[PDB]
Amino acid sequence: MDLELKELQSKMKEMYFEKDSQRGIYATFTWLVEEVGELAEALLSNNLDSIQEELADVIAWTVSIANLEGIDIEEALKKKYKL
């Protein structure tokens, strides 16, 4: 029931890695930025529904980059932060 980081990462890879691989790293980063912009819009509008959606999208595209780069996000977090 409680989603693990490792499961988030592996499930996203199964869904999106083929497409992300095809487009390449810089275009995938450009999508991340597009979604960071949508998060900006959501915060500026103070629309919690939008904020909720764009937070999910920003995480999802950050995970995409982790998957393209072969980096475990859980261990990246634990290396840098006290977790």
Place this chain on the structure above:
Amino acid sequence: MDLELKELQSKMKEMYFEKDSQRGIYATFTWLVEEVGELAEALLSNNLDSIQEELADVIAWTVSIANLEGIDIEEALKKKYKL
């Protein structure tokens, strides 16, 4: 051992919410953007060590915004994505 999203979020709130609250939502978003820029630099340099660090930092600041906005990131993800 396997870090849950809910634990990531709650632990980050304990560490950083007071400081993030003090600075406010738009300055906190500005820090997120600063780290997205560092991720850009890391990708451009193809330095995996840097990429690993900045991915962690981008997630961490995205979680900061979720905490400031009172949004559960796990449920945000599950609402938008098949997880």
